[PDB]
Amino acid sequence: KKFFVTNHERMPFSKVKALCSELRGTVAIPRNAEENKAIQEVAKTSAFLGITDEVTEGQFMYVTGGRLTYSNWKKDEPNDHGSGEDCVTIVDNGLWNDISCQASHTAVCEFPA
């Protein structure tokens, strides 16, 4: 029902959103453990997910709308560490960590099948 693609480049979240929109897709969002693994497999390295709590701190929402349903946070995450972390990356083992949206991570876009 979804295809996940990457050009392997690492960039800040704003650039990922721009890239995926230009391809007419959206930033990858895993709706379950299966999709999560798929994203991990495609990215191979840390990648941003289309999820942020930029609107209301602590309330993670999908960039396409709606409150986060499925999640796979790494232990003790999200932690809004340091000056603040409003973006989400799928790290090693497919676990999630909230991180600065200014950090550079692999762009993965999704397309509806």
Instruction: Write out the residues near Ca ion by the rule CB under 5 A.
Output: 53, 57, 77, 79-81, 84-86, 97-98
Question: From the list 25, 30, 50, 78, which residue makes contact with a copy of itself (rule: CB under 8 A)?
Answer: 25
> Contact region for a copy of itself (CB under 8 A) — 56-64, 72-80, 82-90, 105-113?
105-113
Q: Is 76 annotated as a binding residue?
A: no
Q: Is 53 annotated as a binding residue?
A: yes
Q: Is 70 in the site for a copy of itself (CB under 8 A)?
A: no
Q: Is 42 in the site for a copy of itself (CB under 8 A)?
A: yes
Least gap, CB of 51 to Ca ion (angstroms): 11
Q: Is 36 annotated as a binding residue?
A: no
Which DSSP string do the residues of the chain spell out, in sequence order? -EEEEEEEEEE-HHHHHHHHHHTT-EE---SSHHHHHHHHHHH-S-EEEEEE-SSSTT--EETTSSB--S--BPTT-----TT---EEEE-GGG-EEEE-TTS-EEEEEEEE-
